[PDB]
C-alpha cells in the first residue's frame, strides 16, 4: 500500500551487499534485505514532484526502510532516488550506485584528486576497488594497488589503462611501504584508501597525505599520531551511511549519485560483478556474501 | 664586516634553552641561489625545541629569528626571482644557517615572496607565519565555506586573531573560547562581532554543551585547536562530516573516541606549518600561500595583533618571554 510523499516503483535490479550487524545493533520482527535498487516508478504519492510514473530510477534505500529492496516492487521516499541514464543498463546501475558513492566521497570529499597525484588503493580487485581505480585513472592519478590473491593479481594487471604497480600481499611478506615509497621517488603516497598494519601506512604517507580509513574502532598511539603530525597528514573516516542518516546533506549526496550515473552513462566507470541471478536462491547468494566471500558484485534482476 | 645575531644554546639534562648575542660574519652570496637581505623587520615565535631536535642538526649555537621582511642587498649567480632593492618577506627554514635576528641575513630564494608596498615591514613580518598557519588550517586541512560553523581555540592570541578574521571573511559563524579576563575583553573588541565567546575562566561552562546549543544540535563543522577542553568534549561537539584540526603533536586517540569520529564521518588533520620547509618538495604551493596571505594583508582582511616594535638589543629579553608564552600580542624587532 502506497503512502503520500513516497513512491512505489517496480524493481529492475537489486544488488546486495554485506549487512552490518552491529550498526543495526547500535541503531536499535524482520530484517529488510536489499538497498541498491534500479527500478521504474509505478504509482506516485500526492505530493511527490521530481518523479512521474513510467520513469526509470536508481538509488540506495535507507537503513530504516520499512520495505526490503529484495522484492518485486518497493516503496521509497523521493529524495533517496535519482534518474537512471538511458544508456546505462539496470544491473550496472544497481551494482554501481553504492560503490560509486563510496569511491566518490573517499576520493573527492574526504580526499582530493588531481592530475599527477599518487593513491594506494588497497584490494583493488574488489568491486569497490575496481570502481575506485577507474575514478583515480579518470582524474589522472598514478594508482598503486594491493592484490591479496593470484586471482586478484591477474585481475588487476589486465586493466585496459594499466595501473602503475600491483603489490601482491598474497604471499607471506612484501615490503609495501618500501615498494610504494620506491614507486613515488621518496615522496610517498598522497592518498591511501584503506577501504597492511598502520605503521606501514603512516610511513608510506606522503607529505600532507590523506589516510582515508574505514576502520570503525581505530586505536592511535601518541608516537603514531606524532609521525602524522610531522607529515601534516589527515585521517579521514569513510562511513557510507552518513549522508542517508543526516538530513542536511540532502543535495551533495544526490549530486554524487547523479554524477556516479553520469560517468556510468559515459562508461568511465565499469563495475565488476557476478552474472545476474534472479530472485529465487537470492537468499543463498546473500548467505554466501556475509561469509567474507566475493570479489564480484552480486545483483538480482 | 660583522653583525650581531641572536642565538640560543641548550643544557644537556634540561630541555631549557638560553639566549645569547654573538657577533658573526656576513655570509657572502656567490654562485648560488642565495640572496643577501638587509633585514628591516623580524617577528618572534616560540621555538619548538623538540621538533628541532628531531631534525637531527649538530650545532652548539642555534640561530634565532625566522619571520623576516627586508631589502635584497645582493644575489647569487643563479638567483632569478629577485634583484637588489626588491622588498621581500619570508620565513627562514628550520635548518637555516643565519639568524633572522640580525641586520643582514642570507636566505635561499625559494623561501621569499615580494612584499606589497602598502604593507609595513613590521606588519608583513608579524603576519607571514600566523597567516600561513591560519590559511592552511582553514583552507587546506579544512575547507572554509559560507555558512559553516568554526570553533576556534583562544582567538585572543595572534594566530586566533588572524584565524577569526579569515573565518569571518569567508562568511563563517565563529565560536571561540576565551580564557583570561583580558582575553574576554579582547574578543569583545572585534570589528565584526563573533557569534559566541564561551568564557571558560573557571570550570563553570561546558564548551560541548554551549557549542551544541549554538549549532542547534547539528554540531560544529570545523574545530581549530592550536595554542582547556579535553579530547572527548571536542569529539562530542564536532558535527557530522566535520574536520578536527589539531596542533597536538602527541595525541592519544582511543577506540571509543575514534568510533564516534567514524560514525560522524569526521576527518582529523594535524596542523604543522614546518611541513613545507622540512620536506622541501611542493614548495611552489607554499609560495602561493605566502603570496595570498600577503595579498589578504595588503587589501585589509588581515590586521595582525602586533605589539609595538622593539630594537635588536631588547630581542633577548623579549625572546625569553616569547619562549615561555607570556604575552598575547605579536613581538616584532624593528631595524
Amino acid at each position: 500500500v502506497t503512502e503520500d510523499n513516497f513512491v512505489k516503483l517496480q524493481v529492475k535490479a537489486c544488488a546486495l551487499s554485506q549487512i552490518n550487524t552491529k550498526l543495526l545493533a547500535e541503531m536499535k520482527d524482520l530484517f529488510p534485505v536489499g538497498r541498491e535498487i534500479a527500478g521504474i516508478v509505478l504509482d506516485v504519492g500526492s505530493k511527490v514532484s521530481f518523479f512521474q510514473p513510467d520513469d526509470e530510477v536508481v538509488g540506495i534505500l535507507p537503513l530504516d526502510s520499512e520495505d526490503p529492496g529484495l522484492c518485486e516492487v518497493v516503496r521509497v521516499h523521493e529524495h533517496y532516488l535519482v534518474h537512471k541514464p538511458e544508456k546505462v543498463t539496470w544491473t550496472e546501475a544497481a551494482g554501481s550506485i553504492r560503490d560509486g558513492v563510496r569511491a566518490y566521497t573517499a576520493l573527492h570529499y574526504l580526499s582530493h584528486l588531481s592530475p599527477g597525484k599518487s593513491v594506494l588503493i588497497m584490494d583493488g580487485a574488489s568491486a569497490f576497488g575496481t570502481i575506485a581505480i577507474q575514478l583515480a585513472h579518470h582524474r589522472g592519478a598514478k594508482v598503486i594497488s594491493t592484490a591479496c590473491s593470484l586471482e586478484d593479481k591477474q585481475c588487476l594487471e589486465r586493466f585496459r589503462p594499466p595501473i602503475a604497480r600491483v603489490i601482491d600481499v598474497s604471499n607471506g611478506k612484501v615490503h609495501v611501504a618500501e615498494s610504494c615509497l620506491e614507486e613515488t621517488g621518496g615522496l610517498g603516497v598522497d592518498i591511501v584508501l584503506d577501504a597492511p598494519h598502520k605503521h606501514d601506512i603512516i610511513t608510506l604517507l606522503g607529505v600532507g597525505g590523506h589516510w582515508v580509513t574505514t576502520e570503525e574502532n581505530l586505536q592511535l598511539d601518541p608516537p603514531d599520531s606524532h609521525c602524522l603530525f610531522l607529515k601534516g597528514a589527515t585521517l579521514a573516516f569513510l562511513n557510507d551511511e552518513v549522508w542517508n542518516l543526516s538530513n542536511v546533506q540532502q543535495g551533495k549526496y544526490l549530486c554524487i549519485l547523479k554524477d556516479v550515473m553520469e560517468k556510468l552513462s559515459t562508461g568511465v566507470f565499469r563495475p565488476q560483478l557476478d552474472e545476474p541471478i534472479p530472485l529465487y536462491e537470492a537468499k543463498v547468494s546473500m548467505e554466501a556474501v556475509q561469509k567474507n566471500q566475493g570479489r564480484k558484485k552480486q545483483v538480482v534482476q
Side-chain angles (χ1 to χ4, degrees), chain A:
Chain A
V1 45
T2 175
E3 294 258 25
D4 308 336
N5 212 7
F6 262 60
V7 183
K8 269 200 308 182
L9 40 74
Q10 188 177 79
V11 320
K12 209 65 196 187
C14 168
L16 57 154
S17 71
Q18 222 242 97
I19 274 76
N20 191 309
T21 47
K22 201 222 144 82
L23 272 273
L24 174 275
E26 253 190 338
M27 180 208 163
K28 317 207 86 181
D29 269 14
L30 159 66
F31 318 79
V33 277
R35 283 155 48 89
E36 310 159 40
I37 330 294
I40 168 93
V41 289
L42 278 184
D43 182 292
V44 291
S46 84
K47 47 200 86 86
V48 284
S49 146
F50 311 100
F51 297 109
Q52 318 164 6
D54 205 5
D55 281 356
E56 312 154 29
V57 303
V58 44
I60 310 170
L61 317 184
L63 295 169
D64 60 335
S65 183
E66 198 146 45
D67 260 88
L70 271 186
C71 189
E72 218 208 324
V73 309
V74 292
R75 342 154 189 151
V76 60
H77 202 309
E78 70 172 348
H79 77 324
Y80 285 118
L81 293 170
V82 91
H83 273 122
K84 182 220 57 120
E86 148 184 329
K87 298 198 196 305
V88 186
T89 85
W90 301 261
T91 49
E92 278 181 333
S96 178
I97 192 55
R98 176 97 153 161
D99 302 322
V101 161
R102 301 165 56 81
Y104 226 86
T105 79
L107 290 191
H108 197 272
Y109 284 104
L110 299 94
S111 70
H112 325 277
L113 265 65
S114 47
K117 299 193 104 209
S118 56
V119 46
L120 173 69
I121 306 178
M122 308 217 311
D123 190 349
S126 65
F128 174 68
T130 298
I131 284 299
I133 292 175
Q134 294 179 71
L135 251 186
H137 272 304
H138 174 34
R139 291 302 151 73
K142 200 102 213 66
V143 43
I144 306 175
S145 184
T146 274
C148 309
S149 178
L150 179 76
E151 196 109 58
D152 301 347
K153 202 297 214 177
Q154 46 204 4
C155 177
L156 295 178
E157 172 62 22
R158 313 281 146 65
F159 269 59
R160 178 243 179 270
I163 81 177
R165 184 70 162 287
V166 205
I167 313 291
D168 30 351
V169 71
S170 47
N171 225 261
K173 206 193 207 165
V174 58
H175 300 91
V176 41
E178 286 71 18
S179 302
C180 304
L181 271 170
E182 175 178 42
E183 277 288 333
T184 53
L187 307 170
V189 61
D190 303 335
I191 306 103
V192 344
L193 183 41
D194 204 328
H197 20 42
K198 56 179 189 271
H199 61 95
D200 285 24
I201 301 163
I202 302 178
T203 176
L204 183 48
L205 263 174
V207 46
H210 282 263
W211 176 15
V212 199
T213 197
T214 55
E215 160 62 10
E216 313 160 38
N217 282 270
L218 174 136
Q219 163 73 271
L220 219 52
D221 288 340
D224 306 313
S225 39
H226 179 94
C227 305
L228 292 180
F229 173 90
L230 297 178
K231 296 191 180 184
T234 307
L235 172 60
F237 291 89
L238 170 58
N239 181 343
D240 208 349
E241 283 137 15
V242 287
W243 314 87
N244 323 42
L245 62 80
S246 171
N247 261 11
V248 15
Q249 341 282 136
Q250 285 183 26
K252 332 195 296 179
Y253 178 62
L254 283 180
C255 209
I256 292 183
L257 275 63
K258 229 146 197 135
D259 208 347
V260 157
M261 312 301 304
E262 153 145 33
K263 314 241 174 60
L264 193 51
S265 184
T266 181
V268 183
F269 293 122
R270 69 143 277 263
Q272 102 166 2
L273 67 185
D274 203 49
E275 76 153 284
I277 52 141
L279 244 177
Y280 285 96
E281 281 162 344
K283 167 88 172 167
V284 334
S285 213
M286 206 291 325
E287 274 249 22
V289 175
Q290 198 80 20
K291 207 170 300 300
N292 192 13
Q293 152 204 357
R295 333 258 63 249
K296 308 189 193 64
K297 197 63 166 169
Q298 54 292 348
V299 63
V300 177
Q301 96 181 356

